[PDB]
Symmetry: C3
Subunit: 274 residues, 3 copies
């Protein structure tokens, strides 16, 4: 599956050479195999695309005077930033991720594990958020790695009964969860991939909240376990938001109607009734 | 002390060459000195044991077509994975850890800090679970790093009061914590090492639970603070399980009992009074 | 003119010695070390070399090596990837003064960089997973921040103007950075909201997992989500005695001379109670 960097390079390299800014990794060299690359030294954006390996390397690059002529994404990127935002849709382990949406390594892993169907646009997920599923809870054992001792027959029996568990251990027999648009998820939050299939548009998940059920659109959930504290707007305004879907607007429309985005009062004016 | 990798190599290397998959580190090369090693290029399990440095490197290795013939632990391992499971009983900073038991760096530090006496078999501890002790709560100061300014005279009287503190700051003057077999500890759960001495066999610690006292065998604890939400089985089955001790079974015994391990009702019909 | 933690240590302790790099170097390390003579570490002598371990794992390897036993912390060696690590002298983390023997993790390093923290006191212990973040705006139609990447000049001016007049201080706007006092303890995975908090008082104990939404009085112990006051460490008269005496600003000699009063609260009151 294509990394974030390979997707961006396919868009913007345009015959240039990749300039590696930092110590390379095995994952990086695997991602760069379709491209010509060399260790960075003197870089010019007309001939070079700069790939910082770590966030540390990018900080060093953007402190260098050579970085002044390089534009984000168009001319440079960070390889170890699989959850970093882009102004266009991208895949993360074959999970669609909307524009201006960012998340951390826990959600990257959740995407790799198959727990996520899609992540919406303009969605903000703190880097320490975590998404994981339950082990089986109604067998004699709760361990998962005991299966490393199962031969082919025993594993097939184990896998079949896992698929029949209505509690969806390891997120079996359930839809991967959709994370909506204009969503905010606080630091150290947790979402249970066994029992959650939807984080609705506009939802806010508080810091440290342990989410065990679907979060309705524009609901604000906090606590352990997470419960609804309030809604961001009235139900009439929420229904208007779900009809207008400003997160699908053009960049020109976003600037044209920035006053409605900045003022919920004006938004309900224009769109609530006609 | 013997790292996880050194224990694996002593058991499984079998005269092969260690093929390093990833950037070598100072800690890795010190661990690899007694053995022959090279940067990994073309590898075969007959002549090579693949050591991925980081989990990112292991991800790359398993995506490579060469890894299909390599079996976990027997033929490859991750170096920066001290909490990772092994098919045999291992040590982690002189803490016995049972087969197929894993945990994260936080619990690795707890083993190194002396907070853990042992961890059972087939136990699953989420990578973000953490086990810390309390600082001293009966002094004028709560800082620990102030002791870096203490000379020998001040350090002696500081250490002596910690030793006699009944609340066990830094887990002083108490038994190290035992963690049983078939235990599950969820994401960002917390266990207080100053007060907890046992997580019983089969205990489940839910995501977010803050555990301040011992967890009975097969109890499911949740919440802040942790409370017993339910027990996994009946009283008689718990008693039967503590006598049968399936977590000590051979690999073949486990396979021959897979239906009983899947179905608690069949387990009791077979092993119950 | 901000300086890295390593630069501050080298300026104070290097004393014409040569830096010996212990571990694989990074781009950021090479830039920080370039004003100085440095070599890869082989055989080292603290009389002659200053050992810079790159990562914490490098430091573990160095301290397990025979060559390190004559090396003194900070005076003779340091870890580069340890911006939150304690120093025996008052230091700066970005533009934030940090007291002696005070440590914290990368999240709080980032909070210093973001301008969320005014100062951190002496002998303060902050777990590495503690996190400090501000709120996004909660009075607009959207909660996203990266939507502003699509704002042209005019939309950004309107957006920024409303942020600055928001009394709830989104992104810590229109409020003071928070002052974290001395002798403070902050447990694992604790959260402090940079939008709503301006002071963590001296002696405060923030429990593990606590989400702090309000100012914490001096010597208060707070727990839970949200964090509430559970108790106070000392009596009122003792609290005011401590705030006046300020043992956390004592010299090293004064600390050792009065270790009995630091060990025994009752003796502290007998000696310093007015």
């Amino acid at each position: 599956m294509k990394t974030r960097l390979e997707q961006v390079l396919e868009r913007y390299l345009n015959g240039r050479e990749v300039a590696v800014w930092g110590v390379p990794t095995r994952r990086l060299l695997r991602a760069l195999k379709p491209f010509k690359f060399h260790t960075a030294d003197r870089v010019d954006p007309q001939y070079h695309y700069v790939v910082a390996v770590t966030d540390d390397d990018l900080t060093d690059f953007l402190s260098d005077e050579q970085s002044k002529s390089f534009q984000y994404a168009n001319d440079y990127l960070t390889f170890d930033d699989e959850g970093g935002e882009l102004p266009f849709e991208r895949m993360c382990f074959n999970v669609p991720v909307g524009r201006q949406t960012y998340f951390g390594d826990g959600v990257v892993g959740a995407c790799e594990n198959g727990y996520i169907k899609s992540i919406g646009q303009f969605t903000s997920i703190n880097g320490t958020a975590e998404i994981h599923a339950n082990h089986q809870l109604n067998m004699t054992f709760v361990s998962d790695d005991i299966q490393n001792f199962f031969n082919e027959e025993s594993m097939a029996v184990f896998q079949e009964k896992l698929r029949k568990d209505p509690k969806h251990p390891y997120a079996y027999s359930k839809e991967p969860m959709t994370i909506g648009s204009d969503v905010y998820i606080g630091a150290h939050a947790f979402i249970n991939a066994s029992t959650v299939t939807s984080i609705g548009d506009g939802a806010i998940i508080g810091s440290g909240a342990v989410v065990l059920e679907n979060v309705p659109p524009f609901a604000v959930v906090v606590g352990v376990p997470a419960r609804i504290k309030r809604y961001r707007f009235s139900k009439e305004m929420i229904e208007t938001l779900l009809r207008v879907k400003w997160w699908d607007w053009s960049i020109e429309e976003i600037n044209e109607n920035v006053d409605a985005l900045i003022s919920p009062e004006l938004f309900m004016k224009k769109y609530g009734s006609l």
